[PDB]
Design a protein around this motif. Structure first.
Motif, PDB file in Angstrom:
ATOM      1  N   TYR A 195       0.217   8.885  -5.245  1.00 29.91           N
ATOM      2  CA  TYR A 195      -0.078   7.377  -5.823  1.00 29.91           C
ATOM      3  C   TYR A 195       1.183   6.508  -5.330  1.00 29.91           C
ATOM      4  O   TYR A 195       2.441   6.997  -5.372  1.00 29.91           O
ATOM      5  N   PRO A 196       0.770   5.821  -4.386  1.00 33.03           N
ATOM      6  CA  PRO A 196      -0.379   5.347  -3.968  1.00 33.03           C
ATOM      7  C   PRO A 196      -1.154   6.538  -2.728  1.00 33.03           C
ATOM      8  O   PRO A 196      -0.352   7.175  -2.383  1.00 33.03           O
ATOM      9  N   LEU A 251       7.091   1.286   7.137  1.00 29.23           N
ATOM     10  CA  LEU A 251       8.183   0.254   6.763  1.00 29.23           C
ATOM     11  C   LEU A 251       9.505   0.989   6.621  1.00 29.23           C
ATOM     12  O   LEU A 251      10.476   0.420   6.097  1.00 29.23           O
ATOM     13  N   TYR A 296       7.203 -11.816  12.425  1.00 28.68           N
ATOM     14  CA  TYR A 296       6.566 -10.957  11.684  1.00 28.68           C
ATOM     15  C   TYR A 296       5.564 -11.125  10.470  1.00 28.68           C
ATOM     16  O   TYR A 296       5.851 -12.059   9.843  1.00 28.68           O
ATOM     17  N   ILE A 322       3.226  -9.409   7.188  1.00 33.62           N
ATOM     18  CA  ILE A 322       2.988  -8.123   6.209  1.00 33.62           C
ATOM     19  C   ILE A 322       2.119  -8.548   5.123  1.00 33.62           C
ATOM     20  O   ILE A 322       2.525  -9.602   4.505  1.00 33.62           O
ATOM     21  N   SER A 338      -2.605  -4.349 -10.725  1.00 34.79           N
ATOM     22  CA  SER A 338      -2.161  -4.181  -9.267  1.00 34.79           C
ATOM     23  C   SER A 338      -2.063  -2.724  -8.581  1.00 34.79           C
ATOM     24  O   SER A 338      -1.674  -1.718  -9.372  1.00 34.79           O
ATOM     25  N   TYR A 339      -2.637  -2.472  -7.400  1.00 32.31           N
ATOM     26  CA  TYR A 339      -2.597  -1.038  -6.956  1.00 32.31           C
ATOM     27  C   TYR A 339      -1.692  -0.898  -5.588  1.00 32.31           C
ATOM     28  O   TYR A 339      -2.259  -1.600  -4.546  1.00 32.31           O
ATOM     29  N   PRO A 340      -0.769  -0.463  -5.774  1.00 33.43           N
ATOM     30  CA  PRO A 340       0.129   0.211  -6.918  1.00 33.43           C
ATOM     31  C   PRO A 340       0.824  -0.858  -7.759  1.00 33.43           C
ATOM     32  O   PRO A 340       0.667  -2.036  -7.290  1.00 33.43           O
ATOM     33  N   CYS A 341       1.376  -0.523  -8.812  1.00 33.22           N
ATOM     34  CA  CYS A 341       1.920  -1.379  -9.692  1.00 33.22           C
ATOM     35  C   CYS A 341       3.286  -2.311  -9.441  1.00 33.22           C
ATOM     36  O   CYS A 341       3.646  -3.359  -9.757  1.00 33.22           O
ATOM     37  N   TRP A 342       3.827  -1.525  -8.375  1.00 30.55           N
ATOM     38  CA  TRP A 342       5.212  -1.974  -8.047  1.00 30.55           C
ATOM     39  C   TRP A 342       5.002  -2.640  -6.572  1.00 30.55           C
ATOM     40  O   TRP A 342       4.066  -2.707  -5.785  1.00 30.55           O
ATOM     41  N   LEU A 389      10.771  -3.559   1.179  1.00 28.93           N
ATOM     42  CA  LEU A 389      10.748  -3.107   2.430  1.00 28.93           C
ATOM     43  C   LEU A 389      10.186  -4.088   3.513  1.00 28.93           C
ATOM     44  O   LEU A 389      10.111  -3.670   4.705  1.00 28.93           O
ATOM     45  N   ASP A 390      10.232  -5.106   3.359  1.00 27.26           N
ATOM     46  CA  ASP A 390      10.489  -6.488   4.248  1.00 27.26           C
ATOM     47  C   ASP A 390      11.744  -6.132   5.055  1.00 27.26           C
ATOM     48  O   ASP A 390      12.669  -5.930   4.469  1.00 27.26           O
ATOM     49  N   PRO A 391      11.747  -6.270   6.543  1.00 26.32           N
ATOM     50  CA  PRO A 391      12.958  -6.190   7.405  1.00 26.32           C
ATOM     51  C   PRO A 391      13.841  -7.131   6.991  1.00 26.32           C
ATOM     52  O   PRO A 391      15.120  -6.642   7.021  1.00 26.32           O
ATOM     53  N   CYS A 443       5.322   2.595 -13.535  1.00 27.48           N
ATOM     54  CA  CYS A 443       4.421   1.044 -13.724  1.00 27.48           C
ATOM     55  C   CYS A 443       4.943   0.214 -14.974  1.00 27.48           C
ATOM     56  O   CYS A 443       4.122  -0.591 -15.243  1.00 27.48           O
ATOM     57  N   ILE A 461      15.672   6.921   2.121  1.00 28.98           N
ATOM     58  CA  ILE A 461      14.439   6.204   1.249  1.00 28.98           C
ATOM     59  C   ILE A 461      13.653   7.427   0.622  1.00 28.98           C
ATOM     60  O   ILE A 461      13.319   8.311   1.396  1.00 28.98           O
ATOM     61  N   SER A 501      10.569   9.666   2.315  1.00 31.15           N
ATOM     62  CA  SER A 501      10.579   9.790   3.634  1.00 31.15           C
ATOM     63  C   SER A 501      11.034  11.351   4.385  1.00 31.15           C
ATOM     64  O   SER A 501      11.318  11.949   3.586  1.00 31.15           O
TER      65      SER A 501
END
Ligand SMILES: [Ca+2]
Ligand SMILES: [Ca+2]
Lengths: 227, 227
Positions: A37-38, A45, A156, A158, B36-40, B45-47, B80, B158, B161
């Motif tokens: 999940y997800p 990213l 950019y 997204i 929403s999927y996912p809830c978060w 993580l936008d640059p 969530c 992260i 990661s």
């Protein structure tokens, strides 16, 4: 010299005739283990994913001659599932791939037809990162040596962001060759890429880059802009 | 001067006595709409999220004097869902907040006790980004003027990661003050931050920064390193 700017530096190739189109490299982009999940992987990213991260994924293809209209929309029937599809013919890659989940890099040079302000507009599902200009993208006829050293992004987009769509306005000189790098990802479900521009000379929108995208051979001494 | 390096530049404050601890700023970080999927929210993580993005979120607090052991683990009972919690007392913020979902910035200076190689080890759920050194983090006694111009990260972690945990090795000089910036996010469920170091002088691990973290006033002319 690597920073984004409204007056980017360009290049002046010598006797060797530019080749039509950009180069492309295509890589795999796996979903996570079932039950996750997800379902999709967030690696796209990580800050270095577009610099070194993508290189650990399965290489699918490296092609030349990418030009024309490069926009696409891939409609999936569901999320969390790899599904096959095809790129438009402009990409010079006729084989099926997992269009729901992949990474794609394009690089080369942009040649303007007019001198003045250009505004490029982009949008993407899931991601499109753009570098533009000598240094910012890579060095004049010295790509292979500077390819991993690109700077902060000129524009950019997204999917899901406050920047779902974005613009780049830059002043360019006709007939000069500007380094450009496009980095694209789909992490699941639908895929989309839109790349177009307008100029201050008229009200036409350009979507076909047949007269605009080129590749130049690297040379011993490089080809810095002379104007 | 803004690039990450193994031999970072430091600062030499003049007569004014450094103040104990870092400064902290705390901001909200909302879940997306129910269903929403996912809830978060993926904005973390936008640059540019760590540069300008976070500024549009609700400001919760700005405090001084953050020092001691700054590590924490917050255990949530489900995902969530926003859930209340508290930071350790070292953060000088006694009010409850949504520990499942928030953004936190820390900045100031690191003063070494020994001259030689230092290795900092970090880990985080969900995210910890670190800048270190004059220019890379910000400019000597000219923070307020250079705060948004930090460079590529010296280290980052992260959750989920291939870099769940990371290290920074740098050569430092005792008694010199090095600019440092820490950027943290929780996007849902559990939260964790670990920041510790070792040196080549002995085998002790430092987790308590009482003798190490400081704040310096900005000055008219700045305080560039003099050694
Ligand atoms: Ca997608
Ligand atoms: Ca978390």
């Amino acid at each position: 010299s690597k920073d984004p700017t409204t007056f980017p530096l360009g290049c002046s190739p010598d006797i060797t005739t530019p080749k039509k189109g950009l180069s492309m490299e295509l890589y795999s982009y796996d979903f996570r283990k079932k039950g996750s999940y997800p379902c999709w992987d967030a690696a796209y990213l990580d800050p270095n994913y577009p610099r070194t991260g993508y290189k650990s994924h399965r290489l699918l293809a490296k092609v030349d001659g990418v030009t024309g209209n490069i926009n696409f929309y891939y409609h999936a029937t569901k999320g969390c599932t790899p599904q096959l599809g095809h790129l438009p013919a402009s990409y010079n890659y006729p084989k099926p791939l997992t269009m729901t989940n992949f990474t794609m890099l394009l690089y080369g040079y942009f040649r303007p037809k007019v001198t003045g302000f250009h505004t490029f507009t982009i949008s993407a599902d899931d991601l499109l990162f753009v570098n533009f200009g000598a240094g910012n993208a890579f060095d004049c006829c010295r790509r292979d040596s500077s390819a991993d050293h690109f700077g902060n992004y000129q524009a950019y987009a997204i999917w899901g962001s406050k920047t779902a769509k974005d613009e780049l306005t830059v002043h360019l000189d006709a007939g000069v060759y500007y380094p450009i790098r496009l980095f694209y990802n789909n992490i699941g479900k639908d895929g989309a890429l839109s790349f177009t521009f307008k100029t201050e000379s008229n009200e036409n929108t350009v979507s076909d880059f047949s007269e605009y995208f080129f590749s130049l051979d690297d040379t011993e001494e490089g080809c810095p802009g002379l104007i």
